[PDB]
Design a binder for this molecule. Structure first.
Ligand SMILES: CCCC[C@H](CC(O)(O)[C@H](CCCC)NC(=O)[C@@H](NC(=O)[C@@H](NC(C)=O)[C@@H](C)O)[C@@H](C)CC)C(=O)N[C@@H](CCC(N)=O)C(=O)N[C@@H](CCCNC(=N)N)C(N)=O
Lengths: 99, 99
């Protein structure tokens, strides 16, 4: 699909069995999801934007479907106010910016 | 142009006579640029990401050329790690996300 930017580019994603809404963010290197009681194995990371940093849990090879398109990669979990799909997953669904 | 996302989408912009590098950022509502001087009145605003909030100076109807494409709109100036072009100017240059 084509997503315009008149409003926030929010889409549905499936991750960890669950359906969530997430922002497609070309300004994010990484993908960051709201607290989610997932199983796995993880490494601590701090990620920053803006004002400051949040501490997150980094999980690898997590399957994520984004508007019906499958991806799989690193997902950061933590107290973000908004679920963010970053470039690590956007590249996998073939997302480009055009103007 | 069509821009892929394997690397950060950094482009050259011209703002108040000066050339800068900035990130095309679909996750930002607004355009935020590092400290610099700009003409006209400003007003103070707080903006946030994610990791915290910062205080910025809001300047309205500032011309900004983004990879050769002309925009005129709001620019927030303050302490960011990265100059970011947000949706308010991305819509003006006709930018969309496609996959
Ligand atoms: C709410 C969560 C939205 C997240 C975006 C993030 C981002 O603008 O894409 C920024 C841009 C680069 C940093 C300056 N990217 C980031 O913050 C990302 N950081 C990174 O990618 C960093 N990488 C790592 C590994 O940490 C990089 C800096 O090295 C993080 C998401 C982590 C992966 C963001 O902060 N948006 C702000 C930008 C400021 C602005 N005013 O536009 C925003 O829209 N803020 C609105 C509020 C949001 C809600 N608004 C709304 N209308 N619904 C504002 N008023 O305060």
């Amino acid at each position: 699909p084509q997503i315009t930017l008149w409003k926030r580019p929010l889409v549905t994603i499936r991750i960890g069995g669950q359906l969530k809404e997430a922002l497609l963010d070309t300004g994010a290197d990484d993908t960051v999801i709201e607290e989610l009681n997932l199983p796995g194995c993880w490494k601590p990371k701090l990620i920053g934007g803006x004002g400051g940093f949040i501490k997150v849990r980094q999980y690898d090879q997590i399957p994520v479907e984004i508007a019906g398109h499958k991806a799989i990669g690193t997902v950061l979990v933590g107290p973000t106010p908004v679920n963010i799909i970053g470039r690590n997953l956007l590249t996998q669904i073939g997302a480009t910016l055009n103007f």
